[PDB]
């Protein structure tokens, strides 16, 4: 394993290591804000490493047009569970990272809020949420 | 203690707690499966102004690395 | 109710800060903030 995480020395300067690597994200995306809020210098380095499409970066990683790429965990985990060859490798398990959740955006003060949350907790409280993960997630090895 | 004396054979318990315990004592062994993926919350009274800013503070701590420092203090630590 | 829930419902407690198990039965009586923890259950063997 090469990269420890966001604290890795590679994220200090690509010139610090002999091979000048490259890593970007989706433009106008949510995670781009996290880079700017935490490390504005990282955004300056990511400025020259920008890409256009999610699978375009996936093609670049397979072809070798990109060294590393930063995106969400659940999305990148599924694309790696069905990939042939499995050349691309995930890093960690959400260990040095946000560890947040997925939610439903409601209008402020919606009266549905109490009813919606009761079902969602009950949905994970009876194993029904577990089966849906089996249907749409595939972890080999 | 009872399972340490080899009187018990299985015991349902939390994940991180038993991870830290196996870190402290090498004889403590866990299983492989990971089920009931939920979270721990802050027990509160009924609706009160001590709810909004509390959850906002929890989110602001999760977004940055303070939870990482807490892990380094107690959870990440090993033997 | 008893324990932490009993002491909180009685008014003697204002806020329970403990590794609480988020579940529907207890959420029906009190409120929660967003979870700070992510984990489940396991089996302890020797």
């Amino acid at each position: 394993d090469q990269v420890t995480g966001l604290s890795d020395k590679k994220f200090q300067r690509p010139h610090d290591y002999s091979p000048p690597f490259r890593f970007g994200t989706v433009p106008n995306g949510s995670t781009e804000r996290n880079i700017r809020n935490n490390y504005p210098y990282m955004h300056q380095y990511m400025t020259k490493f920008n890409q256009r499409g999610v699978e375009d970066a996936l093609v670049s990683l397979k072809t070798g047009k990109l060294d590393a790429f930063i995106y969400d965990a659940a999305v990148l985990n599924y694309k790696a569970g069905r990939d042939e060859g499995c050349k691309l490798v995930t890093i960690g398990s959400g260990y040095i990272f946000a560890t947040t959740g997925y939610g439903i955006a409601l209008q402020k003060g919606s009266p549905w809020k109490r009813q919606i949350d009761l079902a969602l907790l009950q949905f994970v409280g009876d194993g029904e949420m577990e089966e849906l993960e089996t249907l749409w997630l595939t972890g080999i090895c | 203690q009872a399972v340490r004396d080899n009187k018990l054979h299985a015991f349902i318990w939390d994940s991180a707690v038993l991870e830290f315990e196996a870190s402290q004592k090498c004889d403590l062994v866990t299983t492989g499966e990971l089920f009931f993926r939920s979270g721990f919350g802050i027990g509160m009274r009924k609706d009160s102004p001590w709810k909004q800013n509390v959850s906002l503070s929890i989110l602001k701590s999760h977004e940055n690395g303070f939870m990482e420092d807490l892990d380094k203090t107690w959870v990440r630590y090993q033997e | 109710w008893n324990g932490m829930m009993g002491e909180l419902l009685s008014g003697q407690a204002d806020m329970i800060v403990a590794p609480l198990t988020i579940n529907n039965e207890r959420a029906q009586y009190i409120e929660f903030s967003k979870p700070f923890k992510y984990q489940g259950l396991t089996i302890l063997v020797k």
């Binding site: 949510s30 790429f69 969400d72 560890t99 409601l106 949905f123 | - | -």
Partner: peptide, 25 residues
Amino acid sequence: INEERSEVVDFSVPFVETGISVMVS
């Protein structure tokens, strides 16, 4: 889920444990 999006709307409870990560070959 971040700050600036929590200012304009309200979220329900989350259901899946997802962070961010870096993909390498």
